[PDB]
Amino acid sequence: VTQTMKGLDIQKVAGTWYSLAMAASDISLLDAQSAPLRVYVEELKPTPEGDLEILLQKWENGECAQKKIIAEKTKIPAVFKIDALNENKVLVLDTDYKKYLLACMENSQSLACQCLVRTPEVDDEALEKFDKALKALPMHIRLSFNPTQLEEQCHI
Amino acid sequence: VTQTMKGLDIQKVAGTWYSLAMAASDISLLDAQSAPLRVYVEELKPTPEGDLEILLQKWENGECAQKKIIAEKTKIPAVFKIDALNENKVLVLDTDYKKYLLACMENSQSLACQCLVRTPEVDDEALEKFDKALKALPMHIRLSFNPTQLEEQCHI
Ligand SMILES: CCCCCCCCCCCC(=O)O
């Protein structure tokens, strides 16, 4: 990923988001309801220090579970770290704060990206920006959700 | 689907094909390795009468199985019928016979389409034609395969 948001203000991505679309480099990352990167964003909570708390849902061991993860800031405003055994990066590609946000997670390559939107509607303009960003990346699975699904736990 | 191949010669689609890409209206049709429309074309066998025999593979009850289905001709050269409990149509959107073929199956709507190619290579021109045909259709999952996967049973 060589598309980052110039001039990102992380405080202004705060609040409610919907995972309208998702893509990944490997089918197995998004294939099943319980695939490892099939995660649905609920809320972004930037910290005063400029870290990013992410509230999401995931189908795990038979049901829809809530998880909270923190992505720590780096020297680059558009790039956060979630490290454990593995060094992983969260990248903000593009946002207008009020309607859409494009982001990817990548390892150290495998990756997964999402088109986030503020409301349970299909934003054709946001999806066209997402597809343009992906034309640069080696994606092998793409999913998108309808407005009914966007209002359900785990997009059921 | 309102894109059919004008002037189709069904005899000239005979022989070896590879399921390079697949798309469908509903995630659940293609999501799992064993999802109902996750089928890999091996061979097209037009009959002297102008019916279409389709040899394909599918992951069913734990393994990669061979199936043969016949799609019966209609009054329209680009449209075949596979009926059982349900009336389903196979539509040929576009082909150049020697490199790529675009086809969909639809019910009576849910649908699934494939980009078929003659060789285990990523044909960017065929994929751009597939994406152009899909921009007309309500697809929510898209998969594509690499050349290593294209040479394995059930694209493992
Ligand atoms: C800016 C944060 C956007 C959240 C989605 C990141 C990209 C998809 C991968 C999600 C997986 C995870 O965060 O564990």
Ligand SMILES: CCCCCCCCCCCC(=O)O
């Ligand atoms: C011209 C035949 C092409 C074969 C693929 C048809 C479209 C995808 C759906 C396959 C499912 C099936 O044929 O049972």
